[PDB]
Design a protein around this ligand. Sequence first.
Ligand SMILES: Nc1ncnc2c1ncn2[C@@H]1O[C@H](COP(=O)(O)O)[C@@H](O)[C@H]1O
Length: 419
Amino acid sequence: PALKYGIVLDAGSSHTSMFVYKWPADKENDTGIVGQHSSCDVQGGGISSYANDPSKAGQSLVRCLEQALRDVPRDRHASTPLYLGATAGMRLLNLTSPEATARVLEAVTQTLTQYPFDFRGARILSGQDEGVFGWVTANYLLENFIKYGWVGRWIRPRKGTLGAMDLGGASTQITFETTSPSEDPGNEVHLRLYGQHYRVYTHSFLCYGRDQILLRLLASALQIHRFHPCWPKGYSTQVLLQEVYQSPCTMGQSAIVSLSGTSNATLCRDLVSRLFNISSCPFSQCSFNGVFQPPVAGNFIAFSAFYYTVDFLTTVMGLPVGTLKQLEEATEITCNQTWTELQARVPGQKTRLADYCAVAMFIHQLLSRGYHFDERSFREVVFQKKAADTAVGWALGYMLNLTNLIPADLPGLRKGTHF
Ligand SMILES: Nc1ncnc2c1ncn2[C@@H]1O[C@H](COP(=O)(O)O)[C@@H](O)[C@H]1O
């Protein structure tokens, strides 16, 4: 059972992760056959964090690349494809400076070309790419693309697919199979996978990733309140205004200001609600900010910072989140904690602790006000970060596409038996 390997570097907004995948050579076009072999988390910031020192972007990757040499058998290095895909961190940098962006891409390319893997390029994914490849990963891993049944008795309707919601640091994506008519070509996706047609909706909200939303709320709190209602009472920090307003996400919104929390769940809710413009919709139905969206439908997996935040609510706060009402209640309780009370629940390192209130509030509003989940549809949402021992994200679907491992049709069209 000879194995083949593939490597993807997920160059995310706040961090880079390396995934190494493996699959049997002779079974490689089977759905669900590829799985994660290993992974490595790059120390420090995302590659976009090196905009003013691009050489360091390439160097950042070396420790994980050295791991990949150990993870993949030597005799297989040369025929193992290596991809780097960058997402909203690089999309934002590209708005600020196409030149700095190109220099960062040049620096990672120079590093990656020094290694013995079959390097296939460093690219910035589109928002659509990011949404769709995440949806592909989840559904591939869970074997939803199998045609269930047997001759003369196929399951009808076709096996449902799992919608995907991904909360990264700089954008958030929602992607799902839909029967609704397409109203905006930018949201419309058609896939031909194992002989089947999937009509998919996708959208990426740039500036609605976790870190960018936290920056926007901080900017807003500074303007409206001169205290931060989402931060816990007794928490304060020295805010460098240059960092607050340097992002494309906050430009629209005295080197240093002190800012303190107040644990005001209601004012926090009000602050978060200003992130969603529902005033206008040029389509039959919108999510928010005038973006076309059909009604959510089917199961969904919510991963990345959706998962991390919900995991904090359930495991650290010890609160149920099974319903939208429970998620709302858990957010209110979290937001109403003082800084001492919150710290008492977290014996170890406290990074991100002051931010859970704001992120939880955001997620609740995004799902309920933004995407228009209600109790019935929300019941179909699961929070998970892994399937079949493989991290859920866009990297796997990306590798599958570029290595051409998912066929449009089954071999010989399976004699036409699925017609
Ligand atoms: N354990 C965690 N709890 C809450 N947020 C997290 C955790 N680990 C990572 N994150 C955040 O998830 C986001 C990942 O963004 P990205 O780098 O674009 O994938 C960043 O905002 C991270 O800070």
